[PDB]
Amino acid sequence: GATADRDILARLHKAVTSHYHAITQEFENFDTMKTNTISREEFRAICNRRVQILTDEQFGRLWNEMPVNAKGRLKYPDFLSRFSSE
Secondary structure (H helix, E strand, C coil), X not given: CHHHHHHHHHHHHHHHHHCHHHHHXXXXXXXXXXXXXXXXXXXXXXXXXXXXXXXXHHHHHHHHCCCECCCCCEEHHHHHHHHCCC
């Protein structure tokens, strides 16, 4: 249930605060056109490396908690602002 989802969010919080600069660089390297977004699949690739290799079900639920725009892309500066807060 909701607890499984919250455990993944806590691990995501820990990864962003521990590797802020490396995660920002990963977003910037995927965001070549500087639109302040990255794709759903690129975000999953970052999660695999920094948090854990999520199942399709876990990733679907994580994506539901992310700041996603109307074009299904991750608003990564909003993500960085929320997951780097103390």
